[PDB]
Amino acid sequence: EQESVKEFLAKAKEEFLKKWESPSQNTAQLDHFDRIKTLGTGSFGRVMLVKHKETGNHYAMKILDKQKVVKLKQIEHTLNEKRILQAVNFPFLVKLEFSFKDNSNLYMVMEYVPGGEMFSHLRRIGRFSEPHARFYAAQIVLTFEYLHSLDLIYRDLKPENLLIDQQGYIQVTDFGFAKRVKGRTWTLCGTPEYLAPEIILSKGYNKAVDWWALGVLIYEMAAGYPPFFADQPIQIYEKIVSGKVRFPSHFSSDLKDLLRNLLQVDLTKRFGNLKNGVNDIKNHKWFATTDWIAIYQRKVEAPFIPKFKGPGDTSNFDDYEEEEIRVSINEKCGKEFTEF
Numbered sequence: 001e002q003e004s005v006k007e008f009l010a011k012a013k014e015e016f017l018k019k020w021e022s023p024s025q026n027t028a029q030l031d032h033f034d035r036i037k038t039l040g041t042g043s044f045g046r047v048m049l050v051k052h053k054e055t056g057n058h059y060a061m062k063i064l065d066k067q068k069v070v071k072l073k074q075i076e077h078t079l080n081e082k083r084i085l086q087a088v089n090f091p092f093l094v095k096l097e098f099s100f101k102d103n104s105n106l107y108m109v110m111e112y113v114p115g116g117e118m119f120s121h122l123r124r125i126g127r128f129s130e131p132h133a134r135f136y137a138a139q140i141v142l143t144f145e146y147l148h149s150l151d152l153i154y155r156d157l158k159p160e161n162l163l164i165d166q167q168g169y170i171q172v173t174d175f176g177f178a179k180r181v182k183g184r185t186w187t188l189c190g191t192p193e194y195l196a197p198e199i200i201l202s203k204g205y206n207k208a209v210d211w212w213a214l215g216v217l218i219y220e221m222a223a224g225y226p227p228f229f230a231d232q233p234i235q236i237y238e239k240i241v242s243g244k245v246r247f248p249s250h251f252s253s254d255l256k257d258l259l260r261n262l263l264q265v266d267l268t269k270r271f272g273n274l275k276n277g278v279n280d281i282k283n284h285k286w287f288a289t290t291d292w293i294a295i296y297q298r299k300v301e302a303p304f305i306p307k308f309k310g311p312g313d314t315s316n317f318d319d320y321e322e323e324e325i326r327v328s329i330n331e332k333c334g335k336e337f338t339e340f
């Protein structure tokens with residue numbers, strides 16, 4: 001690798017480790033914010049558009065219910081998410097601005113990206129052209145080069161987690177499955193369509209699962225549907241482990257070749273996991289037109305700018321029932337979340 005890249009990644013790792021070893025804590029409180037609108041909701045948390053009452057800035061506030069985190073055995077994952085997010089710094093990662101906890105909940109206050117999820121745009125447009133898919137893919141390649149150099153596995157690559165910003169660039173959100181891993185890890189996590197075979201088969205797996213997921217993402221962006229699509233998870237898993245993938249005839253030969261090497265069921269043969277690491281991907285013919293430095297510097301004109309009216313516009317997000325942010329009079333699960 002060019003010494004320029006080595007020295008960049010060495011500095012990136014130094015800066016990450018300093019924050020990793022001494023995490024920030026308790027940098028805002030709930031009553032500093034007005035709630036605006038629920039942007040997403042799940043089994044143990046929600047994401048809320050909020051506005052800071054003094055500065056007027058908008059943020060996406062992820063709120064996790066401590067009792068539900070415990071019940072669903074997600075404690076370590078939530079601690080991973082916050083400790084990692086407060087320590088990273090890269091152009092295509094959403095920034096954590098504040099974090100805090102109270103008697104009931106954990107809070108991560110992130111930048112708000114009003115352009116919405118790639119998922120919505122992809123489903124509205126049908127499929128992306130190869131140049132359009134390649135622009136997004138290149139950002140993920142660089143983001144994974146960064147994260148993996150810090151010994152971080154992301155483990156949740158899917159279109160819903162890629163927000164499109166005001167310049168048309170990606171910002172990766174949701175670090176709920178991200179983990180610092182030297183070697184292997186074992187947790188079953190990730191959306192069915194994106195799971196690598198070694199996860200399905202309950203093996204000790206490594207960063208190669210992220211490169212598999214990139215193959216799935218590129219296929220889905222360029223085709224409009226994922227490669228192992230089926231109606232129930234069991235049938236999806238059978239397809240994933242089979243070693244077979246079919247490509248639309250509109251795919252270029254270069255795209256097919258790259259995808260065969262990312263969607264390699266033998267993890268010891270999978271691009272991103274060989275002796276040349278990420279460079280087997282960056283040097284592949286499908287990326288021949290990609291100016292990696294210009295992408296990193298955000299100097300490439302993006303495929304499209306999402307339509308939105310301003311930093312408080314929620315039009316590109318969905319409508320959800322609005323529920324209270326209740327804070328118990330009594331502290332819940334204090335011991336489990338001491339480090340948050």
Ligand SMILES: O[C@@H]1CNCCOC1
Pocket residue numbers: 042156174175176177
């Ligand atoms: O945030 C984690 C990963 N993303 C999907 C929802 O599950 C929890």
Ligand SMILES: O[C@@H]1CNCCOC1
Pocket residue numbers: 073076077187
């Ligand atoms: O600690 C083990 C692995 N980490 C996540 C799931 O909980 C059990």
